């Protein structure tokens, strides 16, 4: 009982501005995994993941989308740079590491995921180990069967007196790291992860375009295309040797991403083109786009900053003109120097807030207001001095 595409897109909208097509795309991928489980044994083998290739400029949403998708599916996720492997012509590393690295992270998850879904029970039983070294009326019976039976009486007021109140606390934590372990099953835990990898794995391959042709030279194209060749089995369906078991890449979902300014998806090796059935483009972000990014996402950077500052007992407020001013800056720098997409926001927002971020603890209890005035005072000069821009922003 998974979410529908529109449902998936929605959730994605909660974190990413624009890039609707990419969302619908990455959304159909997810839905199809549900769709597949709903078929007969025969078909379940024939239907493979509809791998996607995102086409677009830097920092405009590609990775975030893939990352949020995985999160939403609670699927193990892993990002990987394609060119990493062209290096293998010296030493580099082998592609199988992708599934291996994926599994390791797929484990770190199943672990933290299961251990956390236990740290509460272990603490309660923990006190039942401490509330046992303070009143031990164990065994069967002791007094009455009804009224006198319940031994809680003094014990109850005893545990409460301890909870809110060697060393109990020092003792419990020790019991926590003794009961929790004494409750985990590392056998199925090892296979738990594998099943994940195999049924919900999401591999993100960045720089796919950097692995393409170009009348460049024999040597380089040979190194590049090789990474493509080495990728085939992963994407066509094979078995990988995992430090924790054997994994079948057969249903892992692959989301490749490329600029394709220099190279075209048609330069990709034929076998690969076949296994990247979905093509989607992402647009460059607009100043307007920026303004939304700064605030709309539900854990937007601006929200984070406000929160971080609250920590210090300082109330921050972003004026609309302030936000607009921040956005323009990022855009201005990106156009005057090098366009790095939304990333520019973080640098700008961060330089802008330095003075406060430092003085924060001292303005404890104040009401600071970052309005268009403030912004301009702090960023205009820098934004203008190009050379200074390439260093500070």
């Amino acid at each position: 009982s998974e979410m529908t595409p529109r449902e998936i897109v929605s959730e994605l909208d909660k974190h990413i501005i624009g890039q609707d097509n990419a969302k619908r795309s990455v959304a159909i991928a997810l839905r199809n995994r549900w769709r597949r489980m709903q078929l007969n044994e025969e078909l379940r083998h024939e239907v493979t993941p509809k791998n996607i290739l995102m086409i677009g400029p830097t920092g405009v949403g590609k990775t975030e989308i893939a990352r949020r998708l995985a999160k939403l599916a609670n699927a193990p996720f892993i990002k990987v740079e394609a060119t990493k492997f062209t290096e293998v012509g010296y030493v580099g590393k082998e592609v199988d590491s992708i599934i291996r690295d994926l599994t390791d992270a797929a484990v770190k998850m199943v672990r933290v995921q299961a251990i956390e879904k236990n740290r509460y029970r272990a603490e309660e039983l923990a006190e039942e180990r401490i509330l046992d070294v303070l009143i031990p009326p164990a065994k069967n019976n002791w007094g009455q069967t009804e009224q006198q039976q319940e031994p809680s009486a003094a014990r109850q007021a005893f545990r409460k007196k301890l909870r809110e109140g060697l060393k109990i606390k020092d003792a419990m934590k020790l019991l926590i790291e003794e009961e929790a372990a004494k409750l985990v099953n590392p056998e199925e835990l090892k296979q738990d992860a594998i099943d994940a990898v195999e049924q919900h794995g999401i591999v993100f391959i960045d720089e796919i375009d950097k692995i393409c042709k170009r009348g460049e030279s024999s040597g380089p194209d040979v190194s590049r295309e090789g990474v493509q060749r080495d990728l085939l089995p992963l994407v066509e369906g094979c078995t990988v040797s995992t430090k924790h078991g054997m994994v079948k890449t057969d249903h892992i979902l692959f989301i490749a991403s490329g600029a394709f300014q220099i190279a075209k998806p048609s330069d990709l090796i034929p076998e690969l083109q076949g296994r990247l059935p979905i093509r989607v483009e992402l647009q460059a972000l607009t100043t307007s786009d920026f303004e939304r990014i700064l605030t709309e996402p539900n854990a937007s950077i601006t929200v984070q900053y406000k929160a971080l500052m609250a920590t210090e007992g300082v109330n921050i407020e972003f004026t609309d003109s302030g936000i607009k001013r921040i956005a323009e800056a990022a855009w201005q720098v990106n156009e005057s120097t090098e366009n790095i997409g939304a990333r520019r926001l973080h640098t700008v927002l961060e330089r802008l807030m330095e003075e406060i971020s430092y003085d924060a603890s001292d303005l404890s209890g104040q009401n600071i207001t970052i309005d268009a005035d403030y912004v301009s005072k702090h960023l205009d000069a820098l934004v203008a001095d190009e050379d200074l821009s390439r260093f500070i922003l």
């Binding site: 001095d385 050379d387 200074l388 260093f391």
Partner: protein, 173 residues
Amino acid sequence: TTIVSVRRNGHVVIAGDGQATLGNTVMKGNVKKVRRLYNDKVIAGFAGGTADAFTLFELFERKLEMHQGHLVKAAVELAKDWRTDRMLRKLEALLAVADETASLIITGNGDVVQPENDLIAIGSGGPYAQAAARALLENTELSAREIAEKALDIAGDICIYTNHFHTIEELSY
């Protein structure tokens, strides 16, 4: 072309013409050969590739970056990578940069030279500019700009490869 740098009292200028030639015909007539660099704290001129300059001026402005701003050292380091890297070694151009401190000339040969009276006159018209520049500086109270300009004009009338389109930059201190 003709670039003319002069330094009188609290100012120092770099003026040049805008003629671009090819063979025996004028390619362009308003080429901007002088510009400002390093937060407009440095003024410079170039004789050559309208783009080679672009690459050079930048790296130069990259030296003034993490070298405090010592014009001289920055120039010494610039010419050093210019005389080295194939990339840089490829491009040809005469570099003339001044600043509050002192003005100087950089070349592909990895040469950092500074004329006697911080008077620079590079390009096919350099000599003519110099002769006129000195005559004035010698027998006149005219400003750093008035000489570099009048000097540049004079060159422009003698030199078949330089015109009267000017691009002047100045520095006061």
